[PDB]
Design a protein around this ligand. Structure first.
Ligand code: SF4
Ligand SMILES: [Ca+2]
Ligand SMILES: [Ca+2]
Length: 352
DNA sequence: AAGACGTGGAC
DNA sequence: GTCCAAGTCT
């Protein structure tokens, strides 16, 4: 009630007009391209995402293009970006738009939000940017800026807190330009109101900041500490044959690293025993392995893989039954692999 | 709800 | 080495 919204809006939107970064998705306001950027940015950094966006749109320039495309090429476009469920959900959602909504991204929040991958941030980011809808796009940058502006001491993970934020944004938003107001809060947490050592003396909205006044900015926002993750020992065989082809396999449609290709992998601490028993269980397949060559960790949010690579060679009497395949070295670059098994191949290739 | 779900920028 | 990124599934 004592907050000068209109003055806060003049200062934020002037700063934004000067200091807004030139990013590939800011060249226009196509609902599709905003949506694609919003999804790619989820838990991924702007610098990390820039080259991906440029390549994705080249392969898939329109909503209709991504929907007519095969799930395999859609995934190879996301290769290395992580959280790969976003792209299977984004691909499924663009199909629903083509059918039910006639290739026009919905502009009703509740219809858009009913598409897969579209949550409260994606709803705000697409509808406000491309359609002028005044829906808050409350991401990690906004929570940190708002918790500092308004001294929100509560865990930003709580639904009550996320409601407080949504309501703050509805009060203070500039309904003249919902998009730029939403995009400017983000840019401010990205370039000024940073997590560690914020640039408060370089901030256009320092006068309106309550955490600046009390000198508690560094203590906010309030997020929980990560509890240790499980460590998962993994044995990986890079098997070749006399023709040079490498044995690979595709992972399940459901689970971790779904529908990605990997080298045969097993639980573990003998390893060389558990891996031969597995490849030998395939029809017409005989394996003799060597001594390991590298052992590296690969981190996930929820767990950490402790990988160990065992080189070797393979003799197959006949056709390698799916899910396995034999692929020349030249042709590994076509399949989509997780970053962990991209490393597995580097450490095997330099080992020669 | 709680946890599953990838990776690396930026210090 | 540590945090968390323009978060979402259900
Ligand atoms: S004054 Fe400091 S803490 Fe407050 S919004 Fe600006 S950068 Fe963030
Ligand atoms: Ca939703
Ligand atoms: Ca599975």
């Amino acid at each position: 009630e004592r907050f000068p919204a209109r003055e806060f809006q003049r200062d934020l939107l002037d700063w934004f007009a000067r200091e807004r970064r030139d990013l590939p998705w800011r060249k226009d306001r196509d609902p599709y391209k905003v949506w694609v950027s919003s999804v790619m940015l989820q838990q991924t950094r702007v610098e990390t995402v820039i080259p991906y966006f440029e390549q994705f749109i080249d392969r898939f320039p329109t909503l209709e293009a991504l929907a007519d495309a095969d799930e395999d090429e859609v995934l190879k476009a996301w290769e290395g970006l992580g959280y790969y469920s976003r792209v299977r959900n984004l691909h499924a959602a663009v199909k629903e738009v083509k059918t039910r909504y006639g290739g026009k991204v919905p502009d009703d929040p509740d219809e858009f939000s009913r598409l897969k991958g579209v949550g409260p941030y994606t709803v705000g980011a697409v509808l406000s940017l491309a359609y002028g809808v005044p829906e808050p796009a409350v991401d990690g940058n906004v929570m940190r800026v708002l918790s500092r502006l308004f001294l929100v001491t509560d865990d930003i993970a709580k639904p009550s807190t996320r409601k407080r934020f949504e309501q703050i944004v509805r009060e203070i938003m500039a309904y003249e330009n919902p998009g730029a107001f939403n995009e400017a809060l983000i840019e401010l947490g990205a370039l000024v109101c940073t997590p560690r050592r914020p640039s408060c003396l370089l901030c256009p909205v320092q006068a309106y900041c309550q955490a600046f006044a009390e000198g508690v900015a560094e203590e906010l926002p309030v997020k929980m500490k990560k509890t240790a993750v499980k460590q998962v020992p993994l044995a990986v065989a890079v098997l070749a044959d006399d023709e040079g082809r490498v044995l690979i396999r595709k992972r399940d449609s459901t689970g971790l690293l779904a529908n990605l290709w990997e080298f045969p992998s097993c639980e573990t601490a003998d390893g060389k025993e558990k891996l031969e028993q597995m490849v030998g269980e395939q029809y017409g397949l005989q394996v003799e392995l060597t001594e390991p060559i590298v052992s590296f960790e690969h981190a996930f949010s929820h767990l950490v893989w402790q990988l160990t690579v065992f080189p070797g060679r393979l003799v197959h009497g006949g056709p390698v039954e799916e899910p396995y395949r034999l692929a020349p070295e030249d042709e590994l670059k076509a399949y989509a692999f997780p970053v962990s098994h991209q490393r597995v191949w580097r450490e095997y290739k330099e080992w020669a």
